[PDB]
Design a binder for this molecule. Structure first.
Ligand SMILES: *[C@@H]1O[C@H](CO)[C@@H](O[C@@H]2O[C@H](CO)[C@@H](O)[C@H](O)[C@H]2NC(C)=O)[C@H](O)[C@H]1NC(C)=O
Ligand SMILES: *[C@@H]1O[C@H](CO)[C@@H](O[C@@H]2O[C@H](CO)[C@@H](O)[C@H](O)[C@H]2NC(C)=O)[C@H](O)[C@H]1NC(C)=O
Ligand SMILES: *[C@@H]1O[C@H](CO)[C@@H](O[C@@H]2O[C@H](CO)[C@@H](O)[C@H](O)[C@H]2NC(C)=O)[C@H](O)[C@H]1NC(C)=O
Lengths: 49, 109
């Protein structure tokens, strides 16, 4: 929508969770588990392809 | 609400106009500019508890901490009604020490 505005990644995932109804309190207390989920899922999709 | 469907940027409205064998839309759109730089933090620790913003974001110009909305700049002092508490802050990453003002105490004096 205009000029790029820098933003830390975690504070962007917090906005994206607020976007779907889950409060942002959930993300900051479960960050490591979500990171591991993400990495494992991307590894599995790489292997599947 | 879908982005880039009508215009470039956030959308306000549109006006139609005729043509020989077609239609012409005039889209009115909103575009921000004249940015700044700020230092942030995902929460605030006070009295052993963690406070998160209701709707907004934490900013700091070096020595003071404020809460502002995302798309515009208008600082407000951190009260205890626009921030909500959740648990204790020993597992969150990025917490910052500070003090949070409350409105009831001065009015009780
Ligand atoms: C950050 O902004 C605050 C808010 O303006 C500055 O603190 C105020 O400075 C003015 C004069 O410069 C004083 O009259 C106020 O008493 C200060 N406090 C408040 C709460 O308004 C502060 O100097 C700024 N710091 C930097 C590094 O820019
Ligand atoms: C932002 O990043 C910097 C550097 O990537 C972090 O600073 C590091 O903090 C750890 C402590 O957790 C130290 O062990 C490192 O030595 C620091 N790095 C450097 C280069 O000094 C900083 O903690 C990060 N901020 C947040 C909020 O996560
Ligand atoms: C924020 O304040 C807390 C509490 O004052 C600090 O944590 C203590 O720091 C002192 C000295 O650095 C230690 O002796 C204590 O063991 C710490 N824990 C407790 C429970 O008192 C903390 O270092 C400050 N800074 C940050 C970034 O949290």
């Amino acid at each position: 929508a205009g000029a790029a505005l820098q933003i830390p990644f975690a504070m962007q995932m917090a906005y994206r969770f607020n976007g779907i109804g889950v409060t942002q309190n959930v993300l900051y207390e479960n960050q490591k588990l979500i990171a591991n989920q993400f990495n494992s899922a991307i590894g599995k999709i790489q292997d599947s392809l | 609400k879908r982005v880039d469907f009508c215009g470039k940027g956030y959308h306000l409205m549109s006006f139609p106009q005729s043509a020989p064998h077609g239609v012409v839309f005039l889209h009115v759109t909103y575009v921000p500019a004249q940015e700044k730089n700020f230092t942030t933090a995902p929460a605030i620790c006070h009295d052993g508890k963690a406070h998160f913003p209701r709707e907004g974001v934490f900013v700091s110009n070096g020595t003071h901490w404020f809460v502002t909305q995302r798309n515009f700049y208008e600082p407000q002092i951190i009260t205890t009604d626009n921030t909500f508490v959740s648990g204790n802050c020993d597992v969150v990453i990025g917490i910052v020490n500070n003090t949070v003002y409350d409105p009831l105490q001065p009015e009780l004096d």
